[PDB]
Structures are given as C-alpha cells and as structure tokens.
Design a protein around this ligand. Structure first.
Ligand code: CUA
Ligand code: CUA
Ligand SMILES: [Ca+2]
Ligand SMILES: [Cl-]
Ligand SMILES: [Cl-]
Ligand code: NA
Ligand code: NA
Lengths: 570, 588
C-alpha cells in the first residue's frame, strides 16, 4: 500500500533533495521532498540581484562573453553519476535560449562553469553518461542551421544545413565532440555501459543511436573535421545515399517521437510516441548486433510498442519493473510493466497496463526518485503539468505550472500534493538526502573566486587581512574584509568617472552569517558568504557622497553596517 | 483552523511577499505557503521579459539600466481603513524607488525614482479616507546639493527627507526634511497623522555615533499642515525637481508646523499602527521595550496643550531582548518580535497602558520560540480595522538547522503561526530566498484578478500608439515595417503559430518585434525567444508585448515560443534572416 508521510512539520527535515529547472526564468531551484518547499535558488542564466550573479566579476568570468545575456530557457536538470548511481558532484542543465550548458557544483550550490556550444542553435535535450561515470554531458541542438551561417545560404534543405549532437567533457566543461545528424534532435539519454547514447528526432521519424566508442576511436585517430573557428572535433553521423555512418544508426519510430528515457535496469531506450498513442522500446542489448551489421532491419531492435493512451510524452521508472508515462491529451500518468509489454509485442495476450491516474492538467515531463540510476527506489514521482487551471487561486493572466507529487511506493499511485511553480520548470531530478553533501563555509582556495585571489596577488593584497585602496590611473581597487557588523573599509574617495572595483572578503567564521554590499543608485549588489571573496566593478559617474550598505541582515546592528563613497567632481 | 491545503483545495488568503534582495514581489497562497506567482519589479525576469521588453523599460524609465533592487515593505491600498485590492506598493532601498503593482493584472505598472534622496527603506500607506499618499522613508543623510563640494553629514544642508507619493498618479506629492534619519513608518486612521521611527538622531556615519543617544525619537507628521503649506506656496524645491519641499526640522528648540519629535528608546525600529487606530507602537530594538504613542493625544500635542512630547506616550511595556516589529490580532493583543530572545511575544495593549500608569498588571500573555532571530511579523489584515486574528507570519533571519543544508547561503525561515486562539501555535516553517523581510496577507475575496487582458490596458498603450503611427491594427496585422536601419515587425499570435513566421533584415538593423496574442482562451500564454540574441518575453491572451534588439549576426536565426501553449507548441517557431553587411552599403 502507498502510504508514505508527506507532511514535514516544523523541526523535521525532508528526505530528498529536488533540483528543479527554472524554466524560462533561467535559474536552478533546490526543493525539499516531500514538503515540496523551495530551499534555495541557484542563479545560472538569470541575473540575480540578491547574490549579484551576473553583476559580480566572478560570475561574469564564468559566464564569459555570454554574460551580456540576461536570459535563459531551462528544461533538463541532471546529476552526475559514477557506476550508474548519483555521486553528488555536479548538476548540469541546458539553455535553449542562448545555446549553453551550465555546470553547478553541488557542494557549494553555485554555477561554477558555463559553455556556449559552438556552431549550433538552441540546446534543448540533455542527459548524462551513466557508466563508468559521467565523462560526457550529451546535449541536443534542436534547430537546423546553415554551415557556415554567414548569410550567403539560408536554405534549410542545403547539404550543409543540419544540426548536431553535442558531447561536453563534464569535468573540464570544454567540448569533447559533435556529431552531425539527419533531422531535428528532441530528447536524449545514455545506456549503462558508456558505449551507447540515443536521441529522438523529428523532420515515420526515428531514434538515432550513437556508438560513442566509434566516435571516440575516430577522434583519437584524427578522423574528423572542424567547423568555423571552433577546434571541436566534428564527425558526420548522417546517412549518405542510404549508407550508414560508423557513428550512428537510425531506428524508425512513429511520427515525432518525444521523450527518450533509459530504463533503470539498462534494458531499454524508450521513446514516447506523442502523435502515436504508444511508446517504442529499443533493446539496448541488440544494439551491438545492429552496428555490426548482424540484423536485417533497424526495426529489429524494437522489442515493444505498448499502446498506452493519447499523447505519450515522457517515461520514468520505479525500479520494480514498471514504467510511468505522461499522457498529455488524456491528462494522466499511465503505469505499465515493461516486460509484459515486450511479451505483448511478440503476440501474447497480456495486459501490461496497471493504472492510469488523472493529473491536472496536460502533463509534460515526469520524474521518479533515483530513476536515472540503477538505484531507482520507486518511492516518489513528480508529474509536471502545464495547465493548472483551477487548482490554485487565480493570480492574473499568467498561471503556474502544477508539479504534482505522487506516492508510487505501493501498487497504487496516490496523488498527494499539488506544487505550483513559476515559468514552467518542465522537469526536475531528486536525490536522497545522503547523496548530497554541501559545504557550510567556503574554502579560501575555492576555484570559484580563484581569479580574484590572483588579481589581489598582483596588487600585493592578502585578502584575509587587508583593508586597502589601490589607485591605478582612473582605476580604483578597494579591498576589504567584512565582519558583522562592520565593513573593513567604511569610506573611500574617488574621482568622478573612475572605474571602481570593490573586493570584499567575509572573515566571519560563523555559518549562516552572510553579508551584502549595495551601492545606492549605482545598480551594484552582491552577497559574500563566510570565507568567500566576492568582487564587483562599476563606474563612479555621479559626484557627491554615495552610501553603501550591507544588504543581508547579519546582526542586531545590521541597519548600521554601512559606508560612504565620496566622488570628487571632474 | 485549516492548516494544510490538499490537492484540489484552495488557499484562504493571498500572501504578497517582498522579494528581499532579489527585487521581485511574490504571490503566495496562505496557509499552504506555496508560491503561486512571481511579479518582476526591480529584477530582470528572463521568463516574461520584464526589464527587456519596451513596455517594462518604459515603466522603469531611466532606472531600467539597473538590474537590481532591494525590497522590504509590501502594502495594499486601502479605502476607509480596509484593503480595496487595487494596488500593492513596495520600496527599493538599493536604487531609491517606489513601485506600484496593479492587483488585477498582477504586474508592476508604475515606478518612480524618488528625487534628491538615497535609499527608500520604510514604506506604508495612508489608510483613511483612502490611500491617497504612499509614505516612504529615505534612510541615509546626504548633502543638498550632492555635487561633491560638501561631504560633511553635519552641514546645515545635509539631511534626509520623508516622502509622500501620490498613489494614483505615482508622481511625488511632497517631501519633508527631518532631523536625524528615517527607519520605518505608518499612518493613522484619520488621514491627519503619519509617524516614523528615527535611529540616527546623532547624524553620524560610524556605528558608535549612531548608538550614542539614550533616546532617538519617532517623528510625527501633521499631513494636514503639510498640505496647507503646499497649497499656500510655503515651500521650496531642490535641484531640478519641482516636488514641494517642507522643512520639518527643529530650529533652535522650536518645532516646525509639520512635525513633532517624540523621544523613544533606543535606535527604535518598527513603527506599527494598531488596528483599532489607538496607537503608533515603536519597537525599542536596543531598548527591551515598545513605546505606545496615543494617536488621540496628537492633536493636543501639535496644539501646545501638552508640556512635554513624552506626554503622548501612554505605555512602554518591557517585553524582551531586541523588539523589532509589532502586529495585531484585532482582539486587543499585540505581537512583537524579539530578535535576540528569538521569540514572538503576545501582549495586551490596554493592560500595558495600565501598567505604565503604575498599576501592576501582567500584560505579557505568551512567548513563542521562533527559529531564529525574527525580524518583521504580520497578522492577517493587521493594517486594517478588519484585523481578523487568524494567521501570523514571523520572518526569521537565521534558519540554521530547520531545513536541509544547501551550502553556505541559507534560506530565511518564514514561520506560519495560528493565533485564532489564546495560545499561539507554530504550524509551518517556510523557507524563502534572499530575505523577504516582510509580507502582507489579504482574504481571497479582497483580490480580483483578470484572466484576459483588455486591449486598451495602459500597460501597453504606448505600444498601441507606436503601432498606429505605422498604420497598424494590432488585432489583425502581420506586417514588416521598414524604416531606414530600423525594422518593426508586427504580428498576431494564435497557438500554435506565429503570425509572421519569417522575416529578413540587414546586419546591424534595430529590430522591434511586437506580438499581439489574439487567443481569447484563459491561460494560453505565448513566448518569444530569439536564439543567441538575449531576447525573451511572454505574451498573455489579448496582451501586446514588444522587444527591441540589434540583428548583429548575419545568417539565419531561429525564434521560438517558449511557453507551452498547445500540443503543437514545438512547431510554434520562426526564422529571422540577416543579410550580411558586406552585401549592403558600408558605413563608419
Ligand atoms: Cu552585514 Cu547586515
Ligand atoms: Cu506558443 Cu508554445
Ligand atoms: Ca541613535
Ligand atoms: Cl526525455
Ligand atoms: Cl515597521
Ligand atoms: Na566556460
Ligand atoms: Na514613472
């Protein structure tokens, strides 16, 4: 019987971390599960006034040139794995809007790396290699574009118009390789060996299967081209006059397949039918024979095609042998047994459908706890539905997404909580509490602000102790420690037009004692947590006295942790 | 009392949360404490395009160049001392602004940078006869003018000001120079009086200086006197602002017509009007008390019928260490946060008053442990004469171990407390991001929202005017207007298709895309994102939205609808073709 506790009362703690995509708002969100409360916001592609992400020098360095963009469009959060189990190291997420992949360090809960994927448009589907560990992040670029895209050729049917499958080195966050494909890429997942990955494609469509070992072999042998000014190795996984690449096989699957999900037992890539009221089950164990040319037809790797309902979009797994698929049109989650569907495909009279649960309304993605791992525990399911209609109080023309928590621990799915969320997160990922280990206090050697430590060294500054103003032409570099309730530099004087950099090192050793730094009427704001160094650059374009203050309540005398910038007129 | 809202059940109250240092406003359901909406205000929102669209940047004015705000004090407009559900207002301490949110469309529709001040902190609204004025404190003393000739805070022209904004026009109404600085503020239930705590009577910049005086004060404003002086022309102006400026400073021990200074200990913080209209209650912070100012003794105070300003104090209950804010159940009880003792203390106001007169009575009813270091607190409808005594939210700054660890930065703990009975009962710990500080609740029936936009809504009326100059009917037209190096694309949109699915421009052209969502169905939002150009906005049913960007990259560039709107949503795409600069006339 499905009978888990859903109430986390005061003083009790949640059992799982939930990492939510920030949707069109561009951040990542940390929730407690089963309470479904938001514990933290992690800025990624958004500009965060609170912490200064997008304003500070540390964040803009990580964002690189893409720091000029104030927007992102997220869908697919995933956690790094070792031996097919979450290892708690990194979270990765896509940006469809400006074609990026971001990495979040789960010990500090900050974005620490970001890459603009070269020569593509719109990074949408994203999942991680599972085995032996997450060596690659796999990222779909959705839209076909000309190559080069220099304005001479606009024809999307041109032989050099295509999109590409993208592999990013998870640890260095540099491109590993790109594979040109036929069609548009939708979603993607990886097997439990490291050899295979797959993606659904549109524009009978197909699942494209990648022999990653073959791609890697060709990269090591130098058998690749490069595109534009990117050194990324580029392999051609397209068909040519009906001849296959060594890198890809195209498996025909009903029109416009959508979700592409690897079962936790490693047996299946499951492509959701969308327009077809079905899912197609690709047997991963038959893929070696497919690439060796031992099979008669690419369709032979299909071992199941359960008929489930109207509008199947995504599938997840309880680790007990059941799959759970969203039905967008029927507005349900359908629970079905995978091995029984396989036997049905062979012609046996067996009902593989176990239950349909109405959800509210029009579900897109769904996620069961630990479903992307061989430890899928079958305890919780989140279905993320697009049209909340009357499930929450009206709040004007815009509506929240309805992310519904479902107890799947027993034979019967039970709906237990409706969670409204902002800007359509689309998908989420859960981890056991003991799978995530966070720092309470920053390490002074942390790579996040290591470039700022290096700049301080060029100025002769010991960030742990010093309170000094460095003059350098029209550049002014203030360095200070902060200890509640006092800034280490409480006043400084500059010339109108000077470019001011303020570097603050929080030397409080008490956990949870955050400081802020805001320069009034200059658009300057940032947070500095214990033992962190943060810095921000602005031009003092207004003569006169200009106050700065600590924004984060840190002390009974917080309101008086302030300072003065005096700007002498030109 | 209903604590938990199950699937298909609805919340009983709207909660409007300050977005803290993050700069937005958040709409919550109460008592579930789930977030139903975010309303962008001083932040740049990728999802809806606030801060990127022409409509939002027009509202923000020149302050659209800032990507940050710092919010604390959300309040709802009132008619005859009851919420009327028309507007919400909130402060920006970071760039010295006040913003207005229209509660029917749940959008910020007006914003003002308060002139000649720094840091808008305390904010509350006139209650009676209605919210004519928004009252806003500027916290920091600055020179006037602030041209960089004088930096001395002790100069006779260094001061801060109390600010009145016309709530309906969102233009400045007046400013009152005060002594000291300004912390928090509230208004009475007659329209005559407002009041503000001051923590820096010493006009210092260092911590010890700001703490020297045994008592600072709460300054009381005679708004009737201020209005009379404005109407009489007895005022000055500062710089190029035409806002009437009145001097509410003392000059050699003689009061102005506009103010009275009530001595109150010490670095007082909260300034809360009781829901029965009897008291301004100032929280003592460094003094373990609150001071109770009898509003009905204030006319006598300004009329010289009292010998000492302290004569308007009729209670000073000792409550605990670090009183910060007070709220009211409408049953005669006040609830005050104790930041150091980490508690909410429930106490009876009329009994505190009797104790001040010497009558030994125990006005303290209950002390509830909160977790940890509470700042502001808010009981449902507490700023109105309808204070219903049902729910209390105490917003604590250090959540410590109350939630799962999430790294060095911790959430705020907003704790929901049942006060409908004699005993306060903690029912829910709510984690929030970037220290909201305070919130305001309203009954479900006090808020009425629109699901579909009116085509004449002032939010995008400037865009309609622009379209008209191009001869555009926004409800029908799908046209590309060319004007030199400017391109103005106008399109209707109806799920799952953009009305204009491709268009061609020259490299370097300034492209404005105006989209009118002509779907007439609730909750069919469209999006518009131009890939790799930093362009994103939302368009809700019957809304017109527009965004301007430079086509600086030759080649083909996809745009797509970001918001799920239709089963064929992923087909709602289009293409911008950018002809390269070397094929067009060359400039320098
Ligand atoms: Cu430092 Cu508040
Ligand atoms: Cu329009 Cu999705
Ligand atoms: Ca003082
Ligand atoms: Cl998927
Ligand atoms: Cl207050
Ligand atoms: Na990078
Ligand atoms: Na304005």
């Amino acid at each position: 019987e499905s009978k888990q506790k859903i109430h986390v009362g005061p003083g009790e703690l949640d059992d799982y971390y939930g990492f939510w995509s920030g949707g069109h708002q561009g951040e990542v969100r940390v929730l407690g599960v089963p309470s479904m409360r938001e514990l933290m916001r992690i800025p990624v592609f958004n500009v965060d006034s609170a912490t200064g992400w997008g304003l500070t020098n540390e964040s803009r360095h990580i964002m690189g040139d893409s720091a000029k963009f104030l927007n992102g469009d997220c869908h697919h959060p995933h956690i790094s794995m070792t031996d097919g189990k979450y290892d708690g190291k990194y979270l990765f997420i896509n940006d469809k809007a400006n074609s990026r992949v971001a990495r979040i360090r789960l010990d500090i809960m900050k974005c620490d790396k970001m890459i603009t994927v070269p020569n593509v448009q719109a990074i949408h589907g994203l999942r991680l290699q599972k085995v032996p560990h997450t060596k690659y992040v796999f990222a779909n670029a959705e839209f076909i574009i000309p190559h080069p895209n220099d304005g001479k050729v606009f024809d999307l049917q041109d032989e050099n118009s295509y999109t590409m499958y993208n592999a990013i080195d998870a640890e260095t966050m540099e491109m590993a390789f790109q594979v040109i494909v036929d069609g548009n890429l939708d979603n993607t997942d990886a097997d439990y060996t490291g050899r295979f990955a797959a993606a659904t494609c549109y524009n009978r469509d197909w699942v494209v299967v990648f022999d990653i070992h073959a791609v890697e072999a060709a990269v090591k042998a130098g058998d690749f081209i490069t595109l534009g000014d990117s050194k990324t190795p580029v392999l051609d996984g397209r068909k040519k006059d009906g001849k296959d690449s060594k890198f890809t096989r195209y498996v025909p699957v009903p029109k416009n397949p959508h979700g592409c999900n690897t079962s936790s037992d490693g047996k299946y890539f499951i492509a959701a039918g969308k327009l077809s009221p079905t899912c197609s089950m690709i047997a991963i164990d038959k893929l070696p024979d497919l690439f060796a040319g031992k099979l008669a037809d690419p369709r032979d790797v299909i071992v199941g095609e359960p008929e489930l309902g109207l509008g199947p979009l995504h599938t997840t797994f309880d680790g007990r042998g059941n799959a759970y698929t969203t039905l967008f049109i029927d507005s349900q989650v359908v629970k079905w047994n995978m091995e029984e569907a396989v036997r049905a495909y062979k012609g046996e009279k067996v009902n593989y459908i176990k239950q349909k649960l109405d959800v509210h309304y029009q579900p897109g993605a769904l996620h069961a706890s630990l479903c992307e791992t061989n430890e899928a525990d079958g305890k919780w399911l989140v279905a993320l539905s697009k049209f909340s209609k009357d499930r929450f109080l009206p709040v004007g023309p815009l509506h929240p997404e309805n992310d519904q928590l479902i107890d799947i621990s027993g034979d019967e799915m039970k709906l237990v909580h409706d969670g409204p969320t902002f800007a359509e997160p689309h998908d989420c990922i859960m981890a056991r509490r003991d799978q995530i280990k966070t720092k309470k206090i920053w390490d002074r050697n942390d790579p996040f602000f290591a470039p700022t430590v290096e700049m301080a060294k060029k100025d002769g500054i010991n960030l742990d102790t010093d309170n000094k103003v460095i003059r350098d032409g029209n550049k002014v570099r203030v360095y200070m420690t902060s200890m509640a309730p006092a800034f280490g530099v409480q006043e400084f004087t500059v010339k109108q037009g000077d470019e001011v950099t303020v570097t603050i090192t929080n030397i409080d050793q008490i956990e949870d004692v955050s400081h802020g730094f805001v320069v009034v009427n200059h658009g300057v704001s940032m947070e500095i947590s214990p033992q962190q160094t943060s810095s921000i650059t602005f031009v003092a374009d207004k003569p006169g006295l200009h106050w700065y203050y600590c924004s984060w309540f840190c002390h009974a005398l917080h309101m008086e942790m302030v300072g003065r910038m005096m700007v002498e007129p030109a």
